[PDB]
Design a protein around this ligand. Structure first.
Ligand SMILES: Oc1cccc(O)c1
Ligand SMILES: Oc1cccc(O)c1
Ligand SMILES: Oc1cccc(O)c1
Ligand SMILES: Oc1cccc(O)c1
Ligand SMILES: Oc1cccc(O)c1
Ligand SMILES: Oc1cccc(O)c1
Ligand SMILES: Oc1cccc(O)c1
Ligand SMILES: Oc1cccc(O)c1
Ligand SMILES: [Cl-]
Ligand SMILES: [Cl-]
Ligand SMILES: [Cl-]
Ligand SMILES: [Cl-]
Ligand SMILES: [Cl-]
Ligand SMILES: [Zn+2]
Ligand SMILES: [Zn+2]
Lengths: 21, 28, 29, 21, 21, 28, 29, 28, 21, 28, 21, 21
């Protein structure tokens, strides 16, 4: 999930936006 | 670990900011 | 003033802490 | 919603828990 | 300045990017 | 004043997130 | 782990508080 | 009300920073 | 108290230092 | 790495939230 | 103390309540 | 720079003040 994707390596804002509703 | 707990705190703030009006689910 | 935006920021953090492994949904609007 | 309920009067942890998954 | 621009009304992440180096 | 002080705290965190490796310049 | 990212987030909050009316320049790397 | 709640959140943040290894007492 | 002193006008970190242990 | 410093930052915030009008001592 | 107890392994909000006043 | 100086070991408030305008 988001923790495994984004706590291991920096997620860009574009990458985070995928988690928005 | 605590590491992941603290990272999560920052992730929710980033989603808050990125998602703006859309909102988001946080499901760890 | 951006009072609702600042409120939201703190609500999201509180939900993170209260909800633990359950997580939460911060609705649109 | 949460902003309406919790941005003038403080919501307790119990009240906030109502918004957990 | 940024306080007058973004503390009165919400600034988008686009508007904020303006202040980046 | 206090409102601007609290707003600024959040502004700096948003700029941190938006600007990434670029960093940013903050002046009140 | 995203150590430097989370550190930087706190560094900027500290600079904000310490610098006050001066503001600051965050220029990583 | 909520404005005081948000102010106190930031007060604790600043106390943590300035007080260092001394720590602090927060009383609302 | 601290809320009285510091939520209605800005307290410097030096002023806040009064509340350190 | 400043792990303990970052952890403490988050601990104080969590204490603020949970303790409410009770307040707390932070004695690191 | 709190740092030994809660910076090693995650403390729940309920656990952190022990450090309240 | 600041990340090298202050993310390796804790920086004092005076050390941080170098980065003030
Ligand atoms: O990869 C991450 C982790 C935490 C916050 C953030 O903005 C990005
Ligand atoms: O009513 C609120 C608003 C923001 C944070 C919180 O814990 C409660
Ligand atoms: O206009 C603003 C003010 C503070 C934080 C933010 O993301 C936007
Ligand atoms: O890591 C930090 C930086 C600034 C204030 C604080 O309470 C913690
Ligand atoms: O007067 C204040 C209120 C909140 C945070 C702070 O650093 C100062
Ligand atoms: O009036 C209130 C209600 C809930 C929490 C709190 O700190 C204060
Ligand atoms: O164990 C911890 C450490 C830091 C913040 C928190 O909510 C819990
Ligand atoms: O060295 C540091 C790193 C992050 C916050 C701070 O106050 C000091
Ligand atoms: Cl707003
Ligand atoms: Cl605020
Ligand atoms: Cl990183
Ligand atoms: Cl952190
Ligand atoms: Cl440390
Ligand atoms: Zn705030
Ligand atoms: Zn952190």
């Amino acid at each position: 999930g988001i923790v495994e994707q984004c706590c291991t390596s920096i997620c860009s804002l574009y990458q985070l936006e995928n988690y928005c509703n | 670990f605590v590491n992941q707990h603290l990272c999560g705190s920052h992730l929710v703030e980033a989603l808050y900011l990125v998602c703006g009006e859309r909102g988001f689910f946080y499901t760890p």
